[model samples]
Target: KDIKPRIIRFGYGLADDSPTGKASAHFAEVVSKLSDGKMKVKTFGNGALGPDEQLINSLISGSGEITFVSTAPIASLIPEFGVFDLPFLFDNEKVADTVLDGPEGKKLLDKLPAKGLIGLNYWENGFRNITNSRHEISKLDDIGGIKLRVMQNQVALSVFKGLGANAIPMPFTELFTALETKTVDGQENPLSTIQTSKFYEVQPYLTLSNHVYTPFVFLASKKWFDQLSQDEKDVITQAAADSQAFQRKASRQGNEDALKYLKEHNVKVAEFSTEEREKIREKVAPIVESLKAKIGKETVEGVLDAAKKA
Candidate 1:
């Protein structure tokens, strides 16, 4: 048989209705149809298998077949990803698309093989927003003095701290508890995460800073992938490719409903004024300048070049 029956496991860390969840279903159905039902993708959501780091670890161990993760955590595996984690790198999502899908981005994806993973394509986690119990934030000064939770990484730590906060490093799974217990005054994440994670209940203010963008990259375990015949690999790769566009469009539209739900839940939202946005970018400029050499001059320059073109 050109395509033998197979069960593929796809895991993620969000609710079933979240954008990633929507794409999980899309990828599954596409693989099913393309394989004539020979390959069935079983999706596990809400961290059923584990967190993003663990999911990648599972892939390395060949215990997992597929998963989607933001580019931050993967930066530890591929340092070039740290370039994407730089705050305020893109003016908007369009710029992100051009840099991520362009030749340089594709070359980065091609580096996954040596790491025991295969990157199918990039999708969106969308622009991240800041939220807090402190107050509405319209200016960079508003972020100062608040205790903010950041990803357990130095780049994030430096960015928020540069804006003047006591940045605490912690895992996403522990964030809600920290916010509820008043351990951290604020945090930042995409709107969908705030909606699904129900940060609205604990965090009273949402600041639309669009501080940093995150890419939700689709990944497959290299161990399992290498076993596939060309025809079989074609079915899987093509399904993932179709999911890329489908996921991007699905996530972009998801922000509308997510914002609506948060507003109705009494979560006040504030967008940074153009002047303040520019000021904030200028403030973080030093941090980016310092991280460039650390993130690899070539990766940083390539991303900057692609970003400028976009």
Candidate 2:
């Protein structure tokens, strides 16, 4: 009674070779195995279904089944997700894993059903760094006047502005063209995103700022999920948890590989000195503190506690 022959459409925007794509494919395999072939996940990569906003809208309308997207897009609906975007929130990947894989992350996920979706697990987008066509960013002053493409989120805008750059909130789909035509002087993302998206071809400077760490959320439509049998629900949940572990490992390796490739291709890489990084942390302090009202004080404290414990 629990096993039903169903076709689930899974969608994302990464290339088939990227960590997101690989994890999605792995998730599909886990689903099939757990359901004993009674369920199948058909994946659409490279935005075949649509961008994150359109995909989320489709899920709300019962036209799409599942997708994985960065938290920035979802933050528009669930403000608490913005907590993850707080500048320099986590010290490293281990700290991030602890916070996300623990209670605070699940608490944020629990908020999704009210907004018409289900959050399965958190996967890595990794640490974001600065890249630009103009010049290397070695200090906070160097970032001044560079038009930076940022996610359509207030936290991103505020953080970049706090660093003294002209921050423009744009969709991920438009970033390359914006940079290509000099519509924006720079952008920030995980190293892997810059390399995989080939932004280095247009932007020559890479700063190992690791300023913000982001996570991709695996989401399902509540409309469809609520009707599933208990056994089917269990299978889906377990598969997602399994994929989380596998995906994080793959993503970390991909970050290393991408950075290596970028260096070999002649992209200029720069690192902020200890003093400069401290200055940046200080500059963004007020902006990060101001979000407590929007994101909830308890929730923010919970994440900060988790990060410290890690």
Candidate 3:
């Protein structure tokens, strides 16, 4: 048998057992098997090559073949990615997938080529929840003065800062140590992450504050991707779409499962009241306002319109 072997590197920010990690691994497995072992996808989980933004830079520079990153940091370059970080932009996964895989979603992916990256598909990361060693946060005031580690994205920094907390953006690899050392009093990420990394063991408070919704973008180095045959490109793109749907389904279940696991382990969990959340949202209005020129006003309005319609 004549076999042509190809290698692709996939980097992510969570532990291997996490939703992002699991999905990426599954994608890798399917590709390898579907290609009859001719293609192998190697996954580097838990900030193996630094955090999401560093992975983005690596991919753009052709140093990394592919990466699974939160769409938020790319908003640093494109600004439009900030739409996903807009608090409460999604009511459910279906509403989000419907928009992201639709014309608007394709539009977002289309913007990648100019930046030396090609977005394969959008996988779900679910909504971000806050966990801390500090006091339980049932209201906006509860978050005040706590040092929360956010992803290295300006939008997230602005959001937390608006809520009156000192927001620090750090690489994911350093988060557990930061939490353990009290370098940061808290941090926010998907529940699946907290469980996989076992952060619940270090931090006892889990606040279900869906403060930001982000999708894991499967990105390939544009330089490498452009070298592929049309048929090869089609195969990868189709596989990405299939893998993304699986990721989305798993994300919802994982979020619920993580909560159950946290409670079982004695982590205090709370949901901010409707009024409280709105108050927090109001404070971040400036962050929203500043985004208009970066991501067009129409894009912002369109996302808001979709959320309202949903």
Candidate 4:
């Protein structure tokens, strides 16, 4: 007997107002309506049910259905994903999008099934920027002595450390409390996250370094997806593609709004010159090289080659 309604519960780490959460909610609605209620996507926002790491663990263990998670967290398990987390690798969002949506992206997606995941599509998180209560950081030298919170990914930690900051690696679900409690002086994230997470309230300076361009991956449990009807699976893929497009637009608008709103709220803003940014990138490039060795040089080179050819 076919289940009348297949339920897929989706969760992410950000608040409901966050661009990431908003897109997930929209995806849920779109999927339900498009499937004529044959499928339902239930979204749990604000990391109520734990962060992406825990949720992804559930997906792999066959206890969960689908999730939109930062690929950085899973990069350790699938080291090849380090390609997406490498600092200053993307020329711009356009180049980033073209590579991720093209054949190279599909190749990565196809590899997920063996790892017990069905990589549905990619969602934009935009570029990360530094924010601190300290004086504005416009160059690599200014980052010295600043306490920075980074993601679980070693690449990010290494990048910040190389830039001469006191870098702390923490979970996304714990970032707000850390910021509020002053466990870490500050952190870097996309504007969407800073605005939605209300980091501006805690940290008054917004440095627009525009460092890493990170993308989140949307994935369904292979165990769950394999049980679906072929037609239903097709609909699921189409919904994920649509959600990717929606997320990119939402993230871009959030990026613009994050700056505008932060400035209006009296948050100090600073931008780096092209030369200064190149220097920072050079300072951080060693971390990228180390990661290449850790994750295999050929694999890393392929990702770079693919991005360059894109």
User: lDDT tens string, model 1, 19-138?
Assistant: 879889999999999989999999999778877888889998898999998877787888788877788778888898888888988988998899999998898988999999988888
What would the per-residue lDDT of candidate 3 be over residues 1-310, giving only the tens digit for each residue?
2335788888878888887688888888877776787778898988888888889999998878888888878887887877777777788777887777776777788999999999988888878899999899889999999999987767778778878889999878889999999999999988988898888888989999987778878899999888877756665777787788788877888888988888999999999999998888788887778866666787778777765665
Residue 83: error of model 2 in Å?
Answer: 0.6
Pairs that collide, model 4: none
TM-scores of the candidates are 0.96, 0.96, 0.94, 0.94
Give the residue spans of candidate 1 off by over 4 A: none
Q: TM-score order of candidates, best first?
A: 2, 1, 4, 3
> Which residue pairs does candidate 2 place in steric collision?
none
lDDT values of the candidates? 0.86, 0.89, 0.83, 0.82
Judged by lDDT relative to the true structure, which candidate is superior, 2 or 4?
2
- TM-score winner between 1 and 2, please give it: 2
Clash tally, candidates in order: 0, 0, 0, 0
lDDT of 2 by residue, 166-268 (tens): 9999878778889999999999988878887778899999999998899888899999988899999988999999999999999999999998999999899
Compare the candidates by lDDT and give the number of the best one.
2
Which candidate leads the pack in TM-score? 2
Candidate 4's TM-score:
0.94
lDDT preference between candidates 3 and 4, better one:
3
